[PDB]
Amino acid sequence: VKVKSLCTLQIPEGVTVDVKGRKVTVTGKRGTLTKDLTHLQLDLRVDKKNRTFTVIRWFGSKIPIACLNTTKAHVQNMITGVTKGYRFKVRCAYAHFPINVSVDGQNIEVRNFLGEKRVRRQLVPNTVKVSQTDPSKVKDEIVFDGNDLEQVSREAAVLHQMCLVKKKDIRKFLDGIYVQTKTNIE
RNA sequence: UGUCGAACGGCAAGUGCCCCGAAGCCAUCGCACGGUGGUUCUCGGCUGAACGCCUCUAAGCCAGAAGCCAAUCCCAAGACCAGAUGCCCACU
Numbered sequence: 190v191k192v193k194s195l196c197t198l199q200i201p202e203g204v205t206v207d208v209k210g211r212k213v214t215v216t217g218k219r220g221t222l223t224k225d226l227t228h229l230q231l232d233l234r235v236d237k238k239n240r241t242f243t244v245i246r247w248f249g250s251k252i253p254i255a256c257l258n259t260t261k262a263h264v265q266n267m268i269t270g271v272t273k274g275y276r277f278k279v280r281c282a283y284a285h286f287p288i289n290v291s292v293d294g295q296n297i298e299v300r301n302f303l304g305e306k307r308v309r310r311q312l313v314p315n316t317v318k319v320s321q322t323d324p325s326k327v328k329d330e331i332v333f334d335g336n337d338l339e340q341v342s343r344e345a346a347v348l349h350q351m352c353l354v355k356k357k358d359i360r361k362f363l364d365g366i367y368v369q370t371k372t373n374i375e
Numbered sequence: 376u377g378u379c380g381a382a383c384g385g386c387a388a389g390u391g392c393c394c395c396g397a398a399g400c401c402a403u404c405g406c407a408c409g410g411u412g413g414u415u416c417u418c419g420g421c422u423g424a425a426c427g428c429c430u431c432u433a434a435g436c437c438a439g440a441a442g443c444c445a446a447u448c449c450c451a452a453g454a455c456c457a458g459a460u461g462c463c464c465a466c467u
């Protein structure tokens with residue numbers, strides 16, 4: 190067992206990170222995020238004067254140590270979520286039947302996927318903003334916006350997995366909704 | 376057919392026999408009704424290290440089968456209900 194293993198992260202000026210009982214609260218501009226990490230059993234420290242976040246595993250083998258970088262990635266993702274945000278742009282790809290997508294409030298409706306009469310409905314949580322790009326700029330583009338990377342990516346994946354092609358050769362029937370670009374709001 | 380003399384009324388033939396026949400029982404041979412949510416499988420994914428890259432997995436999440444569990448349905452306190460009540464009596 191390695192006696193001490195640690196990971197370090199620089200904290201920007203406009204964000205504050207608070208740690209208490211393995212519960213991380215990252216609060217910059219544009220909002221605040223909270224991550225429950227009570228399942229990890231690590232030692233989390235924040236030096237506010239030096240703007241550093243440190244996670245330490247004491248007497249760890251490979252399995253406990255591998256969670257150090259995972260915690261660092263999660264805290265980093267929260268930081269860029271509260272500073273710049275997350276924006277996912279997904280595209281509707283079709284061969285013959287156009288994919289008609291309607292976005293009203295927090296509800297997405299997909300019709301005419303491969304000519305099916307069934308309507309595919311999805312309810313986006315209020316923490317993720319959904320919008321449709323005007324067709325003149327980009328054709329068949331849905332944009333998901335939020336501060337939580339996991340919430341934003343889950344919403345895009347949920348939409349993508351709704352329009353799966355069944356009982357067909359997927360190498361030839363490439364119709365679906367795929368996320369094209371992943372960027373930041375600011 | 377026999378029989379009380381005939382007619383009437385019947386009666387015998389272990390319901391004489393034939394037709395129709397209510398009530399009741401009864402036929403997918405007739406008619407009525409047969410519903411709601413979760414936990415997971417397999418699998419597909421998200422985030423993501425180990426291993427600066429990568430990766431559904433290692434810690435975390437999402438979606439998810441006629442399986443499984445509960446609701447609904449049937450019996451139901453030896454499941455000993457200090458559940459709620461109506462009248463007496465007992466205690467007071």
Ligand SMILES: [K+]
Pocket residue numbers: 391
């Ligand atoms: K006879």
Ligand SMILES: [K+]
Pocket residue numbers: none
């Ligand atoms: K008859």
Ligand SMILES: [Mg+2]
Pocket residue numbers: 356357358
């Ligand atoms: Mg076929």
Ligand SMILES: [Mg+2]
Pocket residue numbers: 386
């Ligand atoms: Mg007779």
Ligand SMILES: [Mg+2]
Pocket residue numbers: none
């Ligand atoms: Mg005689």
Ligand SMILES: [Mg+2]
Pocket residue numbers: 402
């Ligand atoms: Mg019957």
Ligand SMILES: [Mg+2]
Pocket residue numbers: 431
């Ligand atoms: Mg999986």
Ligand SMILES: [Mg+2]
Pocket residue numbers: none
């Ligand atoms: Mg099931």
Ligand SMILES: [Mg+2]
Pocket residue numbers: none
């Ligand atoms: Mg009872």
Ligand code: NA
Pocket residue numbers: none
């Ligand atoms: Na990945």
